[PDB]
């Protein structure tokens with residue numbers, strides 16, 4: 001079945017090369033030689049049922065001293081493999097290879113040349129161990145629907161990916177193009193920030209969340225926290241950009257070092273103003289995937305401008321004020337920084353997340369594995385913000401077991417350069433991608 005498969009060099013497409021039997025230790029009929037000109041190669045024709053990730057090994061004889069080789073997957077970029085000795089036939093690890101459902105090619109092209117190739121062995125990459133996900137939320141007093149949401153997420157983890165979108169009107173536009181609706185909708189508490197309210201900002205974020213909760217959906221809430229003070233309010237740096245380090249002189253380290261000041265008083269004014277909106281959601285029975293202090297490690301937001309320690313301390317202020325003081329039990333705490341120095345701690349983080357903005361609709365494998373290492377597989381990993389919706393074929397192949405994905409709004413989801421309607425349909429109509437339809441009755 002799904003195991004090591006050797007492909008003998010003799011039984012392949014030879015371009016300016018020949019089959020030989022002089023050297024000792026080969027497998028099969030013989031081996032391939034005649035690596036003079038640059039155009040000389042071995043084109044192996046391999047096929048797969050689905051799109052999988054295989055490990056590559058080359059069986060070579062470097063009798064003309066140590067040489068270098070070019071490996072080509074489906075007429076793509078070269079990959080130099082070094083052959084160190086050699087007196088006999090031995091094997092080298094040539095990294096990983098992603099094969100697409102159907103016909104594929106693995107060429108061994110003359111680089112330095114003057115070597116003998118016996119065979120190539122493709123082994124399907126190691127299946128990931130079952131995730132050791134924590135069964136319960138950090139808050140012991142967690143309400144019914146938060147406890148339900150966490151269990152449902154825990155049950156689907158590694159099996160499927162929950163589709164998600166930033167803003168309800170964008171979730172409706174997806175239904176207009178794919179006939180499917182994101183299971184998860186993310187809303188921003190941004191226009192609830194007193195600093196912004198003071199300048200006339202209104203928000204329907206609580207209205208949109210409850211609407212989607214009534215449609216049987218999952219709700220994610222982030223907060224673009226506009227600093228209470230320090231607003232430059234310049235033509236270049238307007239008050240409405242007040243969440244940016246660039247737009248405020250607001251020093252969180254100073255503010256936390258002086259807890260009896262006015263700066264710290266206004267900070268709690270802001271947390272309590274937002275707590276009014278969350279309590280309003282709690283009373284409405286809406287479980288929330290609460291994601292405050294997002295992209296902290298980046299430092300482009302005032303809450304991560306003074307480095308990791310003030311950021312972590314603020315996370316714990318929010319956790320004490322919202323969980324203990326305001327007594328909010330509908331919140332599932334989602335951390336949004338990859339770095340260990342920035343990680344607050346396992347006792348205040350329920351689910352780990354990342355914001356990845358790279359074109360191509362890839363599995364964002366590297367970021368997923370970084371968080372696997374961070375939460376040591378005890379916490380679920382989510383793609384809290386993506387620019388490009390991930391393809392389920394690649395998510396599965398690279399075993400990038402993201403719990404959910406949430407494509408950002410304007411200039412991303414509706415931007416053909418990031419997401420085409422074609423790719424959207426492909427993703428939204430997959431048996432791997434859970435839509436609104438498919439998640440119905442999760443609260444039962």
Ligand SMILES: *[C@@H]1O[C@H](CO)[C@@H](O[C@@H]2O[C@H](CO)[C@@H](O)[C@H](O)[C@H]2NC(C)=O)[C@H](O)[C@H]1NC(C)=O
Pocket residue numbers: 229230231249250251254258261262263
């Ligand atoms: C309260 O916060 C404000 C905003 O960060 C602080 O005011 C700024 O202070 C710096 C010096 O530390 C000045 O360069 C700015 O011009 C001030 N801005 C304004 C609009 O006044 C204020 O100092 C903080 N209070 C404390 C005790 O640190």
Ligand SMILES: [Ca+2]
Pocket residue numbers: 008009010026027028029030031117118119
């Ligand atoms: Ca052979």
Ligand SMILES: [Hg+2]
Pocket residue numbers: 204
């Ligand atoms: Hg609106």
